[PDB]
Design a binder for this molecule. Structure first.
Ligand SMILES: CC(C)(C)OC(=O)N[C@H](C(=O)NO)c1ccc(-c2cccc(/C(N)=N/O)c2)cc1
Ligand SMILES: [Zn+2]
Length: 889
């Protein structure tokens, strides 16, 4: 297993100036002819000419139109094509080859493959080598001339990068299309699409140069009615980059294409963005509410790549976070601006502190710029993406909006058209930092540690207030636990957005302030503070850290009710919950360990419950925010704070706490559920696909959250509501009716009803599968078997497989069954999947990421299944490398 180190980057000894492709698609095979106009670089030392090439069937390879002979002129081991230096020209030459590939049987969805009746490519990161020979790395920039030929009635629409410069008929019912793309690009941005595609279209006129841009969104004919929202999102995306960053699109046309089989959400191929259907297609009748935020995010994300990734590209894959962290950040700014709801920011903090914090304390922990990799197909992590985005966001927090826009523009203008590294971005940010602090001595050298240091920092606080002096002090400390990446952790540049709240009237006591913590510890002093304040710390979650506020629950309740920052309120509620959870947890744990016949539990803080009621009953309070405060922290967030977690005890803890709050607030819950119905389920714009109300969807979220709480509590005659709910036109509602009916005998009745509603829409059925998978059923294992036999079968669609199993793995009490049958089940699915799609197989490994955090019994159970998987003879390099690192081998 070859290990690539970041320190070992060297430019190639070769140059590829021009690529000329002929891709001829037939039913049983695809013939790929390629001419590479190449040259010798200044770093050449007379080495062999080595091309990447995986799974290629060689018909003929040549140098300068002279046929090459296999044996003494070249060798091919199905991974590398080696041409011995003796036969490699000393100056400009042409390499050519013809290979046969097989998209119809390519189930790994990398390279060229067939998704239902659409031929589609996916080349990032190392997929182009599966199509033809190439030096498959992002710093090999080349021009592209691409011709695609196929059967006309099966594949009337042909697409590739650049301008379509020719269309022509071919004897035998075939046709061809030529695409020339003069600007240089890395090969991972190459794309080709063929199929019977239908489209929606629009023309966008850019803000400053008034350039006309054609916008096309494609899908199969059956789902062409689900394309409208996507087109709107694209328009919104183009406008935002124009308005915020002053950046326009530079090409004449942009195509968006949905396919049913895709490993991730989407891909940013130049002028030809390719989407997982679930991240591009939606209609109000056939999609749940989450689809609309999802499409906005993903469409936006791939668009923003056009600058941060496509025009300014990567030198090497170790710089991945430079285009991904930055593009996610750009997407967050976009989505927060589009939704105008505080839950947008809250949701991505919620995801970070759950999933990413878990990864960062796991054996898989890595910095956002790793020092090494084996399998590139394991490189695209929540750390690189989501922690990366938070690191990119901190630049904005530190600099402020004005100087950030300055710094960002410096980055774009200086690096446009060439490759870049993380240092290039920090440099640009540093220039703005100098201008902001008004001295060229200031620097951001320490900030670079955010790129190299792994692990989540802990930030803790202590306070002093001198009433006579009117002087307030915040003593801050930071620490990162040592791991396998750094034995010794260094202090980071941590920006702490703070406010001081007067507890007597809830007013701000100081102006907007961002504390710059650059040492292991510091003391921040504030003068003329009239009264002892309650500190509002890390507003907007200004740094990706563990926040230890050391506040009393009384202080937290006061912030929850009266603070101005949405995150700090949400975090205060979170912190109150966590304290309660930890307390009830080893009360239950002690009772179990000591086998007590009787024991006591500490009740939920009564004033806390009162504060929740206060906020819920406030008509001006945000519905989305409301849904968060009545929900306990994610299981994967809680696990970060408990050693040897007994999942049964945690389940009992959550049950007690939910019941405690329910016993006091169920009447309030029911009252709100009924009073919210009118506005939440308003059908006024149900048939307007371009009208999306994120506030209204948040109202539905609240109703479905409340209904779930009421159903679990067996609230009087709540089954009546559930039945009525199932008749709602909104899928979010009638799918909710299915899941909440799990606590009643009408479950399988709604099972059949909702299935009949879902079965004729590919994406809707997958949402139905998710709903069933996450149903709180005691017979969930029997139900899964039913899904496998009657619906899933031997589908290789990643959307189907993920829908059936992933939500189930979040069933705390059932997936972590002490028999280990849950671990056994998913491991079977992983091994089965690994035989045709190694990438999705590692995705299915996610439940195991916390294995060393559980109780000793469940640790062993999980470790056994992982070792069983590791011992599969046909295990992929992909899965093997992942499980080896996860199990510390
Ligand atoms: C949700 C979000 C937009 C953040 O991520 C994606 O939907 N896709 C990411 C991305 O950065 N898009 O711009 C993504 C992640 C991994 C990959 C990827 C990496 C390595 C291999 C493959 C591949 N060949 N899949 O079949 C795919 C492609 C896109
Ligand atoms: Zn991306």
């Amino acid at each position: 297993p070859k290990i690539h180190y970041r320190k070992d980057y060297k430019p190639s000894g070769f140059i590829i100036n021009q690529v000329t492709l002929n891709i001829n698609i037939h039913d049983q095979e695809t013939i790929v002819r390629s001419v590479l106009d190449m040259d010798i670089s200044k770093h050449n030392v007379g080495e062999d000419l080595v091309f990447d090439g995986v799974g290629l069937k060689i018909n003929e390879i040549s140098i300068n139109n002279k046929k090459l002979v296999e044996g003494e002129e070249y060798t091919y081991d199905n991974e590398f094509l080696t041409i011995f230096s003796k036969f490699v020209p000393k100056s400009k030459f042409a390499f050519s080859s013809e290979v046969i590939i097989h998209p119809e049987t390519n189930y790994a969805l990398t390279g060229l493959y067939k998704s239902k009746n659409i031929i589609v490519s996916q080349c990032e990161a190392t997929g182009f080598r599966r199509i033809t020979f190439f030096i498959d790395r992002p710093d090999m920039m080349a021009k592209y001339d691409v011709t695609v030929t196929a059967d006309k009635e099966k594949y009337p629409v042909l697409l590739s990068n650049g301008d379509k410069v020719n269309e022509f008929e071919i004897p035998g019912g075939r046709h061809g299309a030529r695409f020339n793309d003069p600007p240089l690009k890395p090969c991972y941005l190459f794309a080709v699409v063929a199929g019977d595609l239908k489209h929606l279209s629009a023309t966008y006129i850019t803000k400053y140069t008034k350039k006309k841009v054609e916008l096309y969104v494609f899908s199969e004919e059956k789902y062409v009615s689900k394309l409208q929202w996507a087109l709107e999102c694209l328009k919104k995306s183009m406008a935002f980059d124009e308005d915020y960053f002053g950046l326009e699109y530079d090409l004449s046309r942009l195509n968006l294409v949905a396919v049913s089989d895709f490993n991730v959400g989407a891909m940013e191929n130049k002028g030809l963005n390719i989407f997982n259907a679930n991240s591009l297609l939606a209609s109000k009748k056939n999609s749940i509410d989450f689809s609309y935020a999802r499409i906005l995010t993903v469409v936006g994300h791939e668009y923003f790549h056009q600058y941060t990734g496509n025009r300014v590209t990567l030198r090497d894959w170790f710089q991945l976070t430079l285009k991904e962290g930055l593009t996610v950040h750009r997407e967050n700014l976009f989505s927060e601006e589009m939704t105008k709801t505080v839950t947008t920011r809250l949701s991505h903090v919620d995801l970070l502190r759950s999933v990413q914090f878990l990864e960062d304390s796991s054996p898989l922990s890595h910095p956002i710029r790793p020092e090494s990799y084996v399998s590139m197909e394991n490189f695209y992590t929540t750390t690189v993406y989501d922690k990366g985005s938070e690191v990119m966001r901190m630049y904005l927090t530190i600099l402020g909006e004005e100087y950030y826009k300055k710094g960002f523009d410096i980055y774009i203008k200086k690096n446009d058209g060439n490759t870049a590294t993380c240092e290039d971005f920090n440099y640009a940010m540093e220039q703005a930092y100098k201008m902001k602090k008004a001295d060229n001595s200031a620097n951001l050298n320490q900030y670079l540690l955010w790129f190299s240091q792994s692990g989540t920092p802990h930030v803790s606080f202590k306070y002093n207030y001198d009433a006579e002096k009117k002087q307030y002090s915040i003593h801050v400390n930071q620490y990162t636990k040592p791991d396998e990446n750094q034995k010794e952790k260094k202090p980071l540049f941590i920006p702490i957005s703070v406010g001081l709240i007067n507890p007597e009237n809830g007013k701000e006591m100081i102006s907007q302030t961002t504390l710059e913590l650059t040492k292991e510890s510091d003391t921040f002093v504030f003068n003329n503070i009239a009264v002892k304040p309650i500190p509002s710390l890390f507003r907007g979650f200004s740094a990706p850290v563990y926040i230890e506020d050391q506040l009393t629950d009384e202080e937290r309740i006061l912030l929850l009710k009266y603070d101005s920052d949405a995150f700090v309120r949400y975090n205060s509620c979170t912190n109150i919950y966590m304290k309660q959870i930890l307390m009830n947890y080893n009360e239950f744990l002690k009772a179990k360990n000591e086998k007590l016949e009787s024991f006591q539990l500490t009740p939920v803080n009564a004033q806390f419950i009162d504060a929740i009621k206060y906020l819920l009953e406030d008509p001006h309070a945000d519905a989305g925010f409301k849904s968060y405060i009545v929900s306990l922290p994610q299981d994967r967030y809680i696990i970060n704070f408990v050693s040897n977690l007994d999942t049964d005890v945690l389940a009992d803890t959550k049950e007690y706490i939910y019941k405690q709050i329910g016993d006091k607030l169920n009447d309030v819950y029911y009252k709100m559920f009924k009073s919210l119905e009118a506005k939440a389920d308003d059908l006024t714009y149900f048939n307007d696909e371009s009208h999306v109300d994120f506030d209204q969807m948040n109202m539905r979220t609240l109703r479905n959250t409340l209904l779930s709480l009421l159903s679990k509590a067996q609230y009087p005659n709540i089954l009546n509501e559930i039945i009525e709910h199932s008749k709602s036109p909104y899928p979010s509602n009638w799918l909710t009716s299915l899941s909440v009916s799990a606590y009643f005998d009408k479950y399988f009745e709604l099972y059949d009803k909702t299935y009949k509603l879902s079965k004729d829409d590919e994406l809707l059925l997958q949402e139905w599968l998710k709903t069933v998978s996450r149903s709180d059923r005691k017979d969930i294992y029997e139900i899964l078997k039913k899904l496998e036999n009657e619906v899933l079968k031997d589908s290789k669609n990643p959307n189907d497989i993920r829908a059936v199993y992933l939500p189930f793995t979040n069933n705390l009490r059932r997936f972590h069954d002490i028999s280990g049958k849950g671990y056994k089940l998913i491991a079977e699915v992983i091994t089965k999947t690994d035989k045709f799609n190694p990438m999705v197989a590692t995705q299915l490994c996610e439940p195991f990421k916390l294995w060393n955090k559980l109780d000793t019994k469940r640790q062993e159970l999980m470790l056994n299944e992982m070792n069983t998987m590791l011992q599969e003879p046909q295990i992929s390099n992909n899965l093997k490398e992942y499980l080896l690192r996860l199990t510390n081998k």
